[PDB]
């Protein structure tokens, strides 16, 4: 199950994805915040459909009380919910990687989102793309030397076909299995074009910011 997937709503319209890492804490991206007024924002939990149609028995609508911006380099933002989310079979928390951690190249990962699909008539149901971890050397080579990669970044790309996150998928997770456990290894940030065949996705490395995350979440 995928109970950690959050849908951030701006002016009663889905703007971004997010990951529930603690009962009152959501890990998202800075690009998801046009207004500085936290009243225009809402967090939806326990949903499969973007409009929350067939999941009113699970849906957990919550308000945003605080916004904690990550270090200058990161495009991360820790979002505090006005009330803690109640964990059940439909709402759960995603584990974080430890500060000095890594996964090898070819590690099977998944990206989740209610964003742009390209399809004519998209149903609004949560989508997944199967990506595979790429090392920062091969990633810079695959990106035709246009961008040098920092320690704060994580690369993952699909096999042969053109697939990955796009508009509306930002803030969402790059889920990979670490030490027999599903963890949020990256955060979906705007890329250099949507789903280009053989072009891997650049995500913000969560393992790099794990020390700052535990500083904010542990309260």
């Amino acid at each position: 199950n995928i109970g950690w997937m959050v849908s951030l709503r701006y002016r009663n319209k889905h703007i971004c994805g997010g990951s529930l890492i603690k009962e009152s804490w959501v890990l998202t991206a800075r690009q998801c915040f046009p207004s500085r007024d936290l009243k225009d924002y809402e967090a939806w939990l326990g949903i499969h459909d973007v409009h929350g149609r067939g999941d009113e028995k699970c849906k957990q609508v919550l308000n945003v009380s605080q916004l904690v911006y990550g270090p200058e380099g990161s495009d991360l933002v820790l979002m505090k919910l006005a009330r803690p989310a109640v964990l059940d079979d439909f709402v759960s928390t995603i584990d974080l990687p430890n500060y000095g951690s890594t996964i090898p190249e070819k590690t099977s990962c998944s990206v989740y989102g209610w964003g742009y699909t390209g399809l004519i008539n998209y149903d609004g149901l949560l989508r997944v793309a199967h990506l595979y971890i790429m090392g920062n050397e091969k990633c810079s080579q695959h990106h035709r030397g246009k961008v040098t990669l920092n320690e704060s970044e994580i690369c993952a790309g699909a096999e042969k076909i053109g697939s990955g996150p796009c508009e509306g998928d930002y803030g969402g997770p790059l889920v990979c299995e670490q030490h027999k456990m599903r963890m949020v290894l990256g955060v979906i940030v705007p890329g250099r074009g949507c789903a280009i065949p053989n072009r891997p996705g650049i995500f913000v490395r969560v393992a790099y910011y794990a020390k700052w995350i535990h500083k904010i979440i542990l309260t």
Binding site: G113, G115, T117, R127, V128, A129, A158, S163, G164
Partner: peptide
């Protein structure tokens, strides 16, 4: 998600 599948895949 472009070139994606429903979450349960």
């Amino acid at each position: 998600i472009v070139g994606g599948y429903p979450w349960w895949m």
